[PDB]
Structures are given as structure tokens and as C-alpha cells.
């Protein structure tokens, strides 16, 4: 049903996202348990990690488009990624290594993310009707890898330790590279321009040098979040000013500002919602016992099942507004479960968390998936970079919002933690509901501006 290179890109992307979500699923628990961070420290450190993971994407798009070529940069990204996972496994012997290992993952991610997508676009004649189908199968590829990693990584880490989980992340990347190399021949005539000239060693060294510098800068920022704050503040004012110098820019700007709120909410899944599942939810569903950290897999689960249904099924600004309302309902549901449907011992049914992740995933499908493809088309390299930047700033903010649910290490009673999660989720739901209302109010105006 698809070109032969499509399956290749599908499985490369699957295994890379597997490696990334293996870390994401266990990283906050790892900070707290393995490194002895407080919950506040782990949450803000995770926010800075995620911020760098997503604000660097633009570097990798540039390196693929203009310096080394899409396919070369896929290979180099997968190698830096694999090295980062094995360094993280090695952090258990050498704890001082931890922040360098994470910086290496972030930079590797910055290099890799833009390029398989970029490659896949070039697998199809420009108006091939399969394209939309292809890119939905791309999102599902991402979400299958995510679904497997978020499911298994916590179990693995519990039974075999973190070093093994992180080495298996590395190995996921190794086999991503193996399947790329084995199928190299399928993308012979596919690539960006530097893919078809011999490789410039000048530029390759500039890219390596700049990568290593960035690894050290990321490690520093992750260790000193209190200045990552100022750095991303100065950058945001700077990027916005250049954007204004360059009215359909206003439309992308407002939809980006609303996306930021979405990303604050998405950043709770590995942090506050993770610890809410650990602390105040029954760890048994349909009669099976589970690792509560595996609950994060409910987000890719719901995307994998919903995205076929929601491909077959106003326009853009309404779509963003709907997404905002669903996210609001997800947090309002979480608060309600805590306020009214908990046990005498302070625990809630995992079915409430299933419903929370359903709402949050539908929000995701209406904003972050749809938003990328069509906001870009409506607007170009600069706007993707600024979107990635506002996403990074959103993730830092998300870590700081997560800090309000943080639980001291000595509390053992769920009836003490439930009201903290319930107050914070309720307030997040109510602010996101207001945000969705103002969004709706601006839908007609902004939809005139699209004309």
C-alpha cells in the first residue's frame, strides 16, 4: 500500500522512539530513587532535559538540509543517540556521568528528529494521495515504539536494574541503524542535496565540534536549571522580535502560544501524573498487577487506537480549541477522581487514570499532530525553530508546574498526598478550560485571518 522505503522509515523511527521513551518513562523515578533527588529536583531537571530534547530539533533540520544530507544525518544522529543511551547505562558505575549522558541524548535527538520525517516526504510524488495515510502511519510508528517502551522499561528496570534498561535503549538504536543500513538501497535516489555529493569533511567536523560543545552546554543547563530559565527567557524575547520583523504570522503566533499551554500539560505525564499513579492509584487493573510507572503507556495506547478512527473522521482553529477542551477535561477528571471517588485509604480506580489519558491523547491528536503539519503549510524554517523553542520553554514551565505536586520522601499516607494532586489538577483543569474558552472566542476572528 506504500512505497518500499516507507516501511524502512517506519521501523527506523519505531526503534528510535523506543529508545527515547525507555528513558522518558523511567527518568523521574531514576532521579529520585537512584540519584536521591527530591521530587521537586527531579521534576525541574526532567523539564530542562525535555526542553533541550525538543528545542534543539532545528539544528538537526539544518544539518540534514544543508550540511551533510538527510540520510547521513540520520546515521550520525542514531550513532550519537546510541552512545548517549550506553553512557546512561554507564552512569550507574560513574554517577558523575549522568548529566553528560543526558546531554548526549538531547543533542543526538536534536540531530535525528527532523530527518526521517523529512526523508519520508521524499518517498512520494508530490501529490500522491497516499501521503496523508503515510504520515498517519508515521505517528502510529512513533506511538508503537512509545507504547512498547513505556510498557516494558519500568518492568525491566525493576527486575534487572537501570543499566540494563538503558543498554536496551542503546540496542534499540543499534537495530534502528542496522535496519537503516540493510535497506540503504531503498532510498538511493531519495535525499536532500548534500546526500548526493560526496561528504564534506570540513562540515562534518564543524558538526561534530558543535555537537560536543552542545553536549557540555546541555549538561551544564540541566545541572543549573535556575539559569536555563534566564537563557530561555532571553531567547524567547529575541526569537519573537525577529518573528515580528518578518497578518497570517499573527495566526501562527497565537496558535503557537496556545500550543505552549498544551505542552505544559503534556509535560505532566512523566512527572506529576506519573507520581499520582504511584501514590494514589490501585496498581491492579482487570485483575492484573502492574508497575504504576507503566501507566504512562496509556498515552501512546490511546493514540494508536484513536488515530485510525480520527483519520477517517471549524477547521484548524476550532481543532486547536477542541484539543484544549479535551486536555481540560483530562485534568478535571483527575481532580474529580481524587475529590469524590477515592477509597477510605486514599486510592482511586485506575479506570479514572485510563479516562484521563484518553482525554489527554485526544487533545494531543487535535493539537500537536495536526498542528505541526498544517500550521507550517499555512505559514518557514524560522517558524519551525520558533515552534520548537516555544515547546522547549513550555517543557521547562511544565517541570515547574509539576513541582506543586511534589511529595517529601517521608510521607507514607495517601490521604496526605491525594488533596495536593487534587488541588493542583483541579486548578490546571480550570485554567486550561478558561484558555479553551478564549481560544473559542477567537476562532471566528482568526478564521477570517486565514482568508
Amino acid at each position: 500500500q506504500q512505497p518500499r522505503p516507507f516501511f524502512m522509515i517506519f521501523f527506523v523511527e519505531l526503534w528510535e522512539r523506543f529508545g527515547y521513551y525507555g528513558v522518558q518513562g523511567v527518568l523521574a523515578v531514576f532521579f529520585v530513587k537512584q540519584l536521591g533527588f527530591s521530587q521537586e529536583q527531579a521534576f525541574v531537571t526532567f523539564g530542562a532535559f525535555a526542553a533541550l530534547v525538543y528545542g534543539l530539533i532545528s539544528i538537526g533540520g539544518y544539518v540534514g538540509d544543508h550540511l551533510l544530507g538527510t540520510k547521513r544525518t540520520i546515521v550520525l544522529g542514531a550513532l550519537v543517540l546510541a552512545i548517549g543511551y550506553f553512557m546512561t547505562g554507564m552512569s550507574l558505575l560513574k554517577p558523575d556521568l549522568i548529566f553528560i549522558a543526558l546531554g548526549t541524548i538531547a543533542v543526538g535527538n536534536g540531530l535525528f528528529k527532523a530527518n526521517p520525517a523529512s526523508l519520508l516526504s521524499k518517498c512520494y510524488p508530490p501529490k500522491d494521495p497516499r501521503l496523508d495515510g503515510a504520515f498517519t502511519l508515521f505517528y502510529m510508528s512513533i506511538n508503537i515504539g512509545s507504547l512498547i517502551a513505556l510498557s516494558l522499561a519500568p518492568v525491566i528496570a525493576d527486575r534487572f536494574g537501570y543499566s540494563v534498561t538503558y543498554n536496551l535503549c542503546g540496542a534499540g538504536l543499534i537495530i534502528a541503524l542496522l535496519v537503516y543500513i540493510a535497506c540503504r538501497g531503498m532510498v538511493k535516489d531519495i535525499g536532500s542535496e548534500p546526500d548526493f555529493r560526496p561528504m564534506s569533511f570540513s562540515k562534518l567536523l564543524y558538526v561534530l565540534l558543535g555537537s560536543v560543545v552542545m553536549i557540555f552546554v546541555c549538561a551544564w543547563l540541566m545541572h543549573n536549571v535556575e539559569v536555563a530559565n534566564l537563557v530561555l527567557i532571553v531567547l524567547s524575547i529575541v526569537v519573537t522580535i525577529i518573528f515580528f520583523r518578518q497578518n497570517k504570522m499573527f495566526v501562527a503566533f497565537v496558535l503557537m502560544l496556545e500550543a505552549v499551554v498544551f505542552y505544559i500539560l503534556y509535560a505532566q505525564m512523566p512527572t506529576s501524573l506519573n507520581f499520582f499513579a504511584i501514590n494514589n492509584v490501585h496498581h491492579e487493573i482487570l485483575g492484573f498487577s502492574i508497575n504504576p510507572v507503566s501507566f504512562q503507556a496509556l498515552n501512546p495506547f490511546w493514540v494508536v487506537l484513536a488515530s485510525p478512527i480520527l483519520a477517517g473522521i471549524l477547521s484548524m482553529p476550532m481543532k486547536f480549541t477542541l484539543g484544549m477542551f479535551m486536555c481540560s477535561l483530562g485534568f478535571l477528571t483527575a481532580a474529580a477522581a481524587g475529590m469524590w471517588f477515592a477509597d477510605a485509604q486514599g486510592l482511586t480506580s485506575p479506570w479514572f487514570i485510563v479516562l484521563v489519558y484518553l482525554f489527554q491523547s485526544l487533545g494531543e491528536l487535535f493539537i500537536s499532530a495536526l498542528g505541526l503539519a498544517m500550521i507550517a503549510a499555512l505559514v518557514m524554517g524560522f517558524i519551525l525553530g520558533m515552534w520548537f523553542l516555544t515547546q522547549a520553554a513550555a517543557f521547562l514551565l511544565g517541570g515547574y508546574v509539576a513541582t506543586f505536586t511534589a511529595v517529601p520522601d517521608n510521607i507514607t499516607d495517601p490521604l496526605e498526598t491525594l488533596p495536593v494532586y487534587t488541588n493542583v489538577f483541579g486548578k490546571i483543569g480550570l485554567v486550561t478550560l478558561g484558555v479553551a474558552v478564549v481560544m473559542l472566542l477567537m476562532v471566528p476572528w482568526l478564521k477570517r485571518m486565514i482568508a
Partner: nanobody
Amino acid sequence: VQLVESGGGLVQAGGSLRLSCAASGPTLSNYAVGWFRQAPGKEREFVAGINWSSGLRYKDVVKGRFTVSRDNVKDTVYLQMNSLKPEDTAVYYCAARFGGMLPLQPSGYANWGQGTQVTVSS
């Protein structure tokens, strides 16, 4: 995933016993371990526990007599019971729940030992 309790037995009023809970597969380090006890014709009740980061919870009637502790190297959890009284007589079970909480009821815990009998004689 499966816990084993040891150390029970028979002791005279005001003496001491030491239960130990050990796990097999997973590292017990990620788990709050709660000790429950069932006396003849009564419900399982929470006695004492330690979470995954050294926070402690106790039933009122055992404070200042029982101590829960954890050897994270041997991956083992202990219940030292001093000043044992006849009404401490029960089957004692250890239970494991992932994370930092010690809920008071048995439904909060998925992993369970078989139990060891503790008898305190007047």
C-alpha cells in the same frame, strides 16, 4: 513479586522477635513494605512499614515497641518486635507496594508473603 516471611515463633510476654521479609525476582528497593497481622477471628490490620525512601508508618498500639527497618544491600526488610504482649499473637504477613505509600488496607498491596505465626505467652 513473591515475598517470603521468616522469623516467627513462640515467645514469652515482654520478650522480642525479629521478622524478615525477602523478595525473589524484583529488587525490593522500589517497594514500600507493610507488615500486616491477623489474629484469631479478626481482619488483617496494618502493623508497620517502610516506604521506598525510609519513611515509616506504624499502627498506634505498636509504637515504641516495634521497629521496621531496611537493609538495602541484602534487599531485606525487618520487623523488630520488643516488649511483646499476648495480644500481639497473630499470623504476620509482609506486603509490597511499588513506590512511597503505605496504605492501611490489604487491597493497597499486590505482593504478599505466606505468613509466619507469632505467639506471645503470658
